[PDB]
Amino acid sequence: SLVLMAQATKPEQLQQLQTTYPDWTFKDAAAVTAADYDQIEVMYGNHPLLKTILARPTNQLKFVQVISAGVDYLPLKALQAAGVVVANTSGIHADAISESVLAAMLSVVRGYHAAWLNQRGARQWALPMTTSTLTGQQLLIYGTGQIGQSLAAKASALGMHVIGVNTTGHPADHFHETVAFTATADALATANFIVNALPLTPTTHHLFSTELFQQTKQQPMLINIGRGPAVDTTALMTALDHHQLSMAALDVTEPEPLPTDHPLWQRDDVLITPHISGQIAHFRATVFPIFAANFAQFVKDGTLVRNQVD
Amino acid sequence: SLVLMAQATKPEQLQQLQTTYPDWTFKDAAAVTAADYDQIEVMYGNHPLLKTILARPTNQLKFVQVISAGVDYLPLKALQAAGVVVANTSGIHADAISESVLAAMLSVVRGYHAAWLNQRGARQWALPMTTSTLTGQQLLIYGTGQIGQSLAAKASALGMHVIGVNTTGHPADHFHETVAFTATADALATANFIVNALPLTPTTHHLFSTELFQQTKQQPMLINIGRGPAVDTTALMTALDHHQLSMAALDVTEPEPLPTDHPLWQRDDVLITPHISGQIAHFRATVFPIFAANFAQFVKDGTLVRNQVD
């Protein structure tokens, strides 16, 4: 019956909740009272009452949603003993950046980019191109950190085959296969999409350049959400010129900002976005949908859908 | 060890297989022999040998992939008794159309459409817009048939909340909630994206028009992959004019083709695609990735990832 609202919400978030769940009380932690305690089944945000409530062998707490990635000082043993499920707020930035990559890939293969050139052009009722789907294609990602892995998870759920490149070719969550930097020739030959998500180091500078491009055989699309200088701008333009690559999307450039007279801008086969991929809204706006989704599922069947903490 | 290749493959599909799996034999069904029979663990395509093989209480058949949606005349009882897993080829068209909807939505909220106007415009290092993510947003779909459901599955896996509209508000696979046509006011008020995937009938003609648009409160994006006349072109342009809607993507129009002097084309807030969303490649090209994915997973751990037939 009661949710303890320890995290503040926009008035509108609270309204959604109260009308979507007219049999639930969403109680501001200021106005709570000890008569409420055994009523609280869910907590949005960690709060001092967590301790009080768990002390009562008559509490009914079932789900705590914390609003930061850190679960350290939480009474882990009590929560497990009482069977309380907990979720946190990780993956937010990495989720947005992954959506930007999917966006680049989908707008190309589903024909939105070509359709737009058509709409600003001849406005024919057909495109000069054949559409294709992500399902069934190969995605090669350099960087198997948190970002690489969240991109992998989404692509994989969309039916993509996902290969990742890291130092020693060790395993990583959601990637179907991983390879070491020295071991990439085969993955480069079968890739439909190559995504750079690496940090800049001295040995990954101009990593995307003539030799790399020449090892590709499916005329893949190149996407850069790493750093500008990973990619040799000149080699890139010539790889596109000789159809070694079909398309590029760069959310970072060398130099950056990309000056307005740079020839990259004038291409129809390079989509420049001004380093936006990782920009997310304010915490109030990103954290609440996490709770709203976990609570809807909790209400439906007692389980969580996002960021369940083990 | 052996796959019976009863379905033909492009020479290149066969190559991929033989090099990705150098310890497996991919045997053309013409060249098979009864010495092979108990070697065959997988069958790509249904074949007369299915019967022969299953007759031998010494066969090792484990996985049959059929290359059409129909599983009728298949020895269902034998397959179950021998523990054989089977997958088919449903959902192909519906998968592509769903990818087109995701593409429309992602290219808008991740800023690709605005980035392109910027690239053909001032080429600033910023966009006049704030990006947002699909994760956490509400998708309202009219039509809970096979297409609606495959769109629902993908959106839902991307963290969207998905509501569907059908005649009697009955349940449908993957939709979090469904409503009847007469019961849509609330869903329309909280929708971030509205997708039409209905068939044309006399009472769904100009369904997307002034009254409907006026019931929305989140300034949602409208997407039409149903039929042109579901949407009143005039009302649409005026709803966008008064910011009742943020954006539209129409893959169908009234009239269609959309004549080159139609004012819809000149808008920056409507993405016209020329009825491409449902166009898929030739069967050889759509069916093979289904087998390739189910076989990779089968090899990994004996399970299937796509279209497992119960």
Tab-separated table of C-alpha atoms in Angstrom, chain A residues 97-109 113 139 151 192-197 208 213 219-228 230-231 233 236-237 240 245-254 256 258 264-265 267-277, chain B residues 107 110-113 115-116 119 125:
chain	number	residue	atom	x	y	z
A	97	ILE	CA	25.336	6.648	-25.970
A	98	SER	CA	24.260	3.202	-27.069
A	99	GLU	CA	20.938	4.620	-28.316
A	100	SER	CA	22.936	7.181	-30.398
A	101	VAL	CA	24.870	4.376	-32.063
A	102	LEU	CA	21.666	2.419	-32.806
A	103	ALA	CA	20.222	5.674	-34.186
A	104	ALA	CA	23.105	6.190	-36.538
A	105	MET	CA	22.903	2.593	-37.798
A	106	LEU	CA	19.079	2.440	-38.105
A	107	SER	CA	18.637	5.774	-39.785
A	108	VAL	CA	21.092	4.589	-42.459
A	109	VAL	CA	19.912	0.988	-43.089
A	113	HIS	CA	19.082	9.392	-44.240
A	139	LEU	CA	28.703	-5.299	-35.227
A	151	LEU	CA	25.774	-1.207	-26.813
A	192	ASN	CA	28.865	-4.706	-41.306
A	193	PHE	CA	29.396	-1.910	-38.666
A	194	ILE	CA	32.513	-0.824	-36.848
A	195	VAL	CA	32.146	1.233	-33.717
A	196	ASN	CA	35.001	3.018	-32.000
A	197	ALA	CA	34.362	3.527	-28.285
A	208	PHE	CA	41.174	3.995	-37.889
A	213	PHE	CA	40.109	0.264	-43.688
A	219	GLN	CA	31.945	-2.154	-47.102
A	220	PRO	CA	30.945	-1.476	-43.460
A	221	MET	CA	29.664	1.701	-41.804
A	222	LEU	CA	32.170	3.381	-39.425
A	223	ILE	CA	30.941	5.034	-36.245
A	224	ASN	CA	33.123	7.086	-33.906
A	225	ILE	CA	31.957	7.799	-30.393
A	226	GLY	CA	35.494	7.448	-28.962
A	227	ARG	CA	37.754	10.469	-29.574
A	228	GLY	CA	38.366	12.462	-32.712
A	230	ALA	CA	41.308	7.784	-33.337
A	231	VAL	CA	40.262	8.369	-36.919
A	233	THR	CA	40.089	12.117	-41.478
A	236	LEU	CA	38.371	8.053	-43.979
A	237	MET	CA	37.404	10.295	-46.902
A	240	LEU	CA	34.603	6.263	-48.652
A	245	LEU	CA	33.378	1.987	-46.362
A	246	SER	CA	29.694	2.679	-47.120
A	247	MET	CA	29.010	5.482	-44.575
A	248	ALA	CA	30.374	7.129	-41.414
A	249	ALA	CA	28.848	8.795	-38.359
A	250	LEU	CA	31.219	10.837	-36.301
A	251	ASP	CA	30.096	12.280	-32.994
A	252	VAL	CA	33.703	13.371	-32.373
A	253	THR	CA	36.194	14.828	-34.843
A	254	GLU	CA	39.856	15.891	-35.299
A	256	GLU	CA	36.921	19.564	-32.744
A	258	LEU	CA	34.867	20.703	-36.743
A	264	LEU	CA	33.676	16.392	-44.025
A	265	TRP	CA	30.557	18.546	-43.643
A	267	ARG	CA	29.700	14.852	-47.766
A	268	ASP	CA	26.309	13.055	-48.007
A	269	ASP	CA	27.939	9.906	-46.614
A	270	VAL	CA	29.207	11.243	-43.285
A	271	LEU	CA	26.806	12.206	-40.495
A	272	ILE	CA	28.400	14.739	-38.200
A	273	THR	CA	26.871	15.160	-34.805
A	274	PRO	CA	28.471	17.704	-32.487
A	275	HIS	CA	29.638	15.460	-29.608
A	276	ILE	CA	26.093	14.987	-28.335
A	277	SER	CA	25.909	11.223	-27.879
B	107	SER	CA	16.969	9.486	-35.401
B	110	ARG	CA	19.143	11.141	-30.565
B	111	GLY	CA	19.413	14.233	-32.742
B	112	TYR	CA	20.360	12.782	-36.139
B	113	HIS	CA	17.610	14.614	-37.938
B	115	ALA	CA	22.223	17.211	-36.748
B	116	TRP	CA	21.605	16.832	-40.469
B	119	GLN	CA	25.192	19.955	-41.243
B	125	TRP	CA	28.909	22.662	-32.723
